[PDB]
Symmetry: C2
Amino acid sequence: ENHNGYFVYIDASGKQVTGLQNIDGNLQYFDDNGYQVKGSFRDVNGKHIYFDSVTGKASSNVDIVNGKAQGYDAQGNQLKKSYVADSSGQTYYFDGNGQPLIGLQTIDGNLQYFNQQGVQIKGGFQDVNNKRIYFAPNTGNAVANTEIINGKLQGRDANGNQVKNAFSKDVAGNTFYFDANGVMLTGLQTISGKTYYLDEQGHLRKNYAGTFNNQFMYFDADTGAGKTAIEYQFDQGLVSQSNENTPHNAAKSYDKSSFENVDGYLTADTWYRPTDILKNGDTWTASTETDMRPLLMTWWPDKQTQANYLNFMSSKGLGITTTYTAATSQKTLNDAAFVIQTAIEQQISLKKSTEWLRDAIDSFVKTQANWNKQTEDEAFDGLQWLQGGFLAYQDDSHRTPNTDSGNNRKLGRQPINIDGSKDTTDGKGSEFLLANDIDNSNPIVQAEQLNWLHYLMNFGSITGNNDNANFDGIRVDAVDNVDADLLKIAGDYFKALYGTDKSDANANKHLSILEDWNGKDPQYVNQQGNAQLTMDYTVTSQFGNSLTHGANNRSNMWYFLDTGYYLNGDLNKKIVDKNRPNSGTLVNRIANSGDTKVIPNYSFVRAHDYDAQDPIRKAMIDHGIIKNMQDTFTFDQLAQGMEFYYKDQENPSGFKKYNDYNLPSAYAMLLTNKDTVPRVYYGDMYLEGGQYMEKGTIYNPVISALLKARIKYVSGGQTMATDSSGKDLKDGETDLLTSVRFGKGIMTSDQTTTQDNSQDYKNQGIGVIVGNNPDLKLNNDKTITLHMGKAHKNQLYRALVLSNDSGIDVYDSDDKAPTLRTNDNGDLIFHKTNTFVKQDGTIINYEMKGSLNALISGYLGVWVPVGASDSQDARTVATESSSSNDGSVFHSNAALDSNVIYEGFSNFQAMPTSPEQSTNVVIATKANLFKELGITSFELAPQYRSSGDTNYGGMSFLDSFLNNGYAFTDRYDLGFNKADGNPNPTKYGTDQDLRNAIEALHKNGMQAIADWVPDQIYALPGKEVVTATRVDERGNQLKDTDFVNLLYVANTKSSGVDYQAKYGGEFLDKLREEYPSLFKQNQVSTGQPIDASTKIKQWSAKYMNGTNILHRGAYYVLKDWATNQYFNIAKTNEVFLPLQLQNKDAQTGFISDASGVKYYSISGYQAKDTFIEDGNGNWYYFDKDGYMVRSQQGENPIRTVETSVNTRNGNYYFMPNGVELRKGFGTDNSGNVYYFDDQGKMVRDKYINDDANNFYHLNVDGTMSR
Amino acid sequence: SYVADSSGQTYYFDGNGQPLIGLQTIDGNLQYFNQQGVQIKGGFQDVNNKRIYFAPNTGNAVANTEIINGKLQGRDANGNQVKNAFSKDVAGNTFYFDANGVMLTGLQTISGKTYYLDEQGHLRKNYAGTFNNQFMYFDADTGAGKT
Ligand SMILES: OC[C@H]1O[C@H](OC[C@H]2O[C@H](O[C@@H]3[C@@H](O)[C@@H](OC[C@H]4O[C@H](O[C@@H]5[C@@H](O)[C@@H](OC[C@H]6O[C@H](O)[C@H](O)[C@@H](O)[C@@H]6O)O[C@H](CO)[C@H]5O)[C@H](O)[C@@H](O)[C@@H]4O)O[C@H](CO)[C@H]3O)[C@H](O)[C@@H](O)[C@@H]2O)[C@H](O)[C@@H](O)[C@@H]1O
Ligand SMILES: OC[C@H]1O[C@H](O[C@@H]2[C@@H](O)[C@@H](OC[C@H]3O[C@H](O)[C@H](O)[C@@H](O)[C@@H]3O)O[C@H](CO)[C@H]2O)[C@H](O)[C@@H](O)[C@@H]1O
């Protein structure tokens, strides 16, 4: 609290705090009056403690104590032998006695200067002694620097002496040379028999190629010394590898028998069958089919990998421990590989096992960048945040034909982009979300999704011959991440089977909702005839801004009205604005009399996936239970975190760190709004963790009352107003929102009676008053009014719910509540101070007062008419007549509004401790309870068997390890028993438990909603080889990635023996016979109808768009660098292997001939049309003819390269010895300078910066303007 | 231990001799390391949702301000944007940022105390001026106006 400009702290006790206090982990102080101290020193006990100027938090400073400076730490101890920075960012060093050092000093091996007051000189020169020394900006350490004396640059070394006949730096990082006279040199200079190039400024240029002595000259990256680049830098001549061991280690066979493989290809951890085995390191013996050995014992992709293998295996006791490099001779490495092979066979005999080796190879393989995620470009922006990035599979019939999709895989066909017309913009859908993304643009897959849909809508019929245990409707998960055809497919299915387009009674018997977050989805859904209900994020959003989020600065309640709906916000005139910038809330409620058609919708305050998952994890992070949001956690870890979350939720202080504010007030509005189907979140009713329905939340009573009141009173028209005109509040204004419903046939304030002369209205209707300001106090004059309407003149009303300083009181019946009577015009008038009387006769006192406690931060009052019958029902039944010929399914009206959906699960529930406490068992016993709260549809969690802790590569997701059912391997397994007969429940119970749960809900007149999850599937056990490109969520290639059309081992193939195999495609034939039009109707995104001619009993890559990155590497599938062809052994007519393995002679190295230089890879093949790196790290390009590209005298060294590997296409600068220039400037034959990047490519049309803070500009044609 | 290489770049090697990567706390200091294990110094960095500035020589996490669109914004040491509060920049200037995140200017009364911010938005301390038409000295400690 703030009093007279000062912070005071008032305890949980209610006591004002003085003295030193650690409050919530921060050390602070308050003087005798209780005010807090900031930017000052205080003395407590033996400590001299400074407190910060912003926060008032204890930290280090320097005080002038008496006449002298003395340093202090956070705890208030005098510091000795240390450095302290003071309030103004100045630095002292205090010695062994606590006294600050002055003058020149050597501290921790560093030279530093201190002024006469003990302050450290930083970022300037300083005349200590005869010499002048520069001291660095942040360290303050002595360093070489240059300054301008007269008009000429001069150099100063670290000792403060001027530099003569030598090179010296400046702080920025530029090197200069200064001659005998001290003067900086320029241009081309030969000193100590070596030649350096200094630019016009005098900067020494390193890694710079230029024609300097009329003959090319490359200036060293190390020292800038000019070499002629005539000497070849490759150190490996052409050598033969074959020897006495070659025929023994060669493969027994060139096929799947002798080679571990995937779709014919080989992998880094492949093992093969050699012809013979050096058993025990003694005697070569023919191999038996079980004698498999690792390919890396005998072959390597390149010398670097070979050297790394030798060093790694050496470290494990297998030979002389070695430092080998790619520069080591090939002959040496091969000899060393054999002594390791010997040692290996000895440890195989000694251990009588090869498992130890499997683990050694696996370990070694993950060490190498090409075989781990370092070549996968892990990224976390956008949806990549979930799992680290995506790979899009490609159609490549030449290399990977099993994986070809038949020209499907249209990505990002979300509703707004169903036809691809926004593919080039951000309007393209984020097709990739999680795990293996199913290709819902493929007609065959579309048919399979319909089969699954049929299976769910007839679950009970099919699995228990129980026609009462069937789901009634669906929730469509992740609409914006799949092909929008699925909506039409689902819509048309329900039309065909249930005649949902015939009547509101048919439609409303199968309530179906969409998870459709895009702000333009509502209008799409409505153009397509509302086959499923859109969400209304606009109201959920406004709850966030005005009530639910944040302790203080909240949007005004005014924003709920959306007055812009009317021209000039003319609430007097009420002219609807026919043309607006596509904005505002979906349904206006200022004066909604049901006269204008509106888009039917569901709405909510929270969800299993909204305002839950993030807070619950932030809480775990905040208490050090995990480090990252993507971090894997155990259920025990979750339970501990949950305890902090609950503690925060129920905090009597009223402050909430992770949880949402004002949930009751939010539900009061959600549950009284016209033209919406409200949805209630299990986790606002019961605690989100632990056991299902284990313990109610503090909000439960209030929400329960609102729910029951909704059945009795909520009908008719609506109005909504605020004591507020905009962002800013005038003097009297409270910003208190007043929402009213009138009764069954009453549509307006001024309507006094129904047209049909029904009397139902008189005891119906409701009044809601809500505020978002806990510190709200009314002026004494101020009156606040609820216009209950002219159909309710002089009527007695009683409170349902009233907020106060300790909680919110809930009144169950007319007798126990305060009454108040409306006037002749039908208004309930409220003042700052009120005296209400019970109908009994008792008098009650009540202030219109903002309150702050666990249940509210603001005001909440709800009022209902007294005299309500016990069985009073204000709901409207849906009519069987064909009311509309518009073609649409759902219509927003009184009937639809009479529904309430309950989202009845939480992602963070604990696993059942016993079968009796399984969610679906509990639902069956408690069905009664939900009927009486007015739930007409029960949204059950997804019932599919969780993929669990299974993880074939890449990052696991919480859906999977929390077993919530959104992550599954088998789409048709909803809790079936193991094949041995044992029970095998999901998190929610067996399949019988589910059928019982569904039946129980029908016995209590409620529907059951199936969560339809078509976007992805997790943890498929079978491997295939795909052609993959690294992409972002929309399937766009990452800008700077080498990972393009590469072969990759993915987990895409289903077991083939699961419930997907049993029930896959089975119901389609029966359906085509009975409803032919479903199978003949064309879909929009494809132009085709769904295709039931092919059944999906087993998933595989051809039906997938892609996957999250699996951490295997860009080149885990083995390839020859020289030809760029991948090794394969599937068909004996098209085998490609390294020549060693076929007992042929593999020659490897560089060899010159009259025409030029050639290169042979470790596998014995000639490099053509490919880049090659030598053992010293230099790069070369070999042209289509097989010859190294090299610059000639008088010719342009810049060459344009078009390779088989497209990503490398570009302009390169090859020197006379063929070395590609990288990360440096290169001069062409005509004097123009270009720059070439990390990978050798020319850079165009941008500014480029230097480590020394030099800037250069490169024109569009590549040249450097600088 | 820390080691700086030939080019003046810095790594930290752990108990096994392997360099640390990503966000780390060392000697009680928060620091970031790129995918190659190199230490980020003198720049912003999007680690998680938050954006954090790391100091030029220490590389330690600190509050800083950057210009987003055409308006100065404030970033704290944890990488969260600053709203309704004072925040520094690396140079040493203090600013105040309102509920909307926007830096304030001129004479401002917040939490019943009065501060003077110049045209650039710098909080002025140890500054004497006739501000409310009556003399006012702005504190050397916190910049709060006394009479
Ligand atoms: O223009 C001067 C008037 O400004 C205020 O009036 C705002 C309007 O209020 C009523 O309609 C609103 C309707 O706009 C919408 O508001 C949602 C949301 O708005 C604010 O949050 C925004 C946030 O969405 C985001 O905006 C980004 C930009 O989006 C578009 O490009 C906009 O055109 C642009 O202006 C936005 O900047 O980020 C913004 C910055 O952080 C943020 O401002 C507001 O803070 C939230 O509380 C609010 O939920 O839906 C509301 C219902 O939910 C409607 O009530 C009026 O009908 C409309 O005419 C107004 O223009 C101000 O109050 C008026 O007094 C000014 O005259
Ligand atoms: O931090 C505890 C440690 O501090 C001293 O060690 C310093 C070390 O911190 C470093 O100083 C560089 C630089 O850092 C601060 O920002 C300071 O303001 C600035 O003046 C300082 O120059 O480098 C030196 C070199 O070894 C170290 O000595 C203490 O000496 C040590 O005993 C403390 O434990």
